[PDB]
């Protein structure tokens with residue numbers, strides 16, 4: 001019986017003249033640039049993302065990204081209507097967390113790993129409060145603002161649940177199989193609890209310092225592996241306490257898996273005694289970051 005409330009997010013349309021590209025970051029192509037609005041004496045570092053069937057997907061993505069506002073989720077600064085539609089967002093200078101953990105494998109300690117798990121769970125809990133199923137959570141879709149501050153991005157697959165709707169039922173469409181809950185593979189059902197499965201895989205990627213899950217197994221074999229009860233193995237650095245959390249994320253009964261709000265509590269506790277839980281060897285004047293550039297709502 002609960003109804004739906006209005007979404008009064010403001011979609012800001014940026015003029016192409018207001019921002020300068022600088023370099024490519026990966027060709028979907030994403031550029032790094034500088035946005036210099038109105039007559040404001042500020043310069044904001046941005047990332048800039050860019051056949052009729054595809055502009056619909058980029059506008060669904062802009063819709064979601066314009067509707068989120070949390071320190072651990074990436075939000076839209078605005079869109080630019082060129083030949084192709086561009087999404088403009090805060091530059092996350094250290095890039096994606098997957099690459100970051102691979103590049104700094106030898107220097108990442110237990111405090112960082114556990115704090116990232118907390119922050120990812122915070123962002124995901126926020127998305128859950130907004131009734132959004134992300135559907136593509138993975139370390140490649142977490143971005144690094146600084147080593148101490150990460151945010152979830154890439155809302156290309158995300159879906160808004162009705163006020164009294166548990167599930168999104170997908171049609172066909174490519175979905176990254178190695179991060180998907182078993183029920184999503186077999187039945188195309190997605191929920192907040194399927195996102196929790198992906199979260200566990202994401203934690204595993206972190207705790208192996210960026211290993212590929214089920215490395216060298218074809219995606220078409222993953223369903224039958226999971227059905228037999230096999231799961232990703234215990235990373236070497238992980239105590240049983242940390243692995244148990246991961247394993248719980250990969251239970252067959254979706255409602256048995258932890259909730260994001262529980263994951264925040266559990267990883268917060270572990271971050272206070274990090275070496276109890278992970279055993280790890282060797283443990284421009286007018287530039288404004290977009291977190292200090294506030295746009296009325």
Ligand SMILES: COc1cc2ncnc(Nc3ccc(F)c(Cl)c3)c2cc1OCCCN1CCOCC1
Pocket residue numbers: 025026030046047048049065087088089090091092093094095096099143153154155
């Ligand atoms: C400094 O690097 C980035 C900062 C970023 N800052 C903000 N957003 C990014 N991506 C992004 C993601 C979704 C969006 F809607 C928009 Cl507008 C942008 C960013 C992507 C970035 O790089 C993506 C790097 C992808 N690597 C680069 C090549 O190696 C494999 C994948």
Ligand code: NA
Pocket residue numbers: 275278279280283
């Ligand atoms: Na230690």
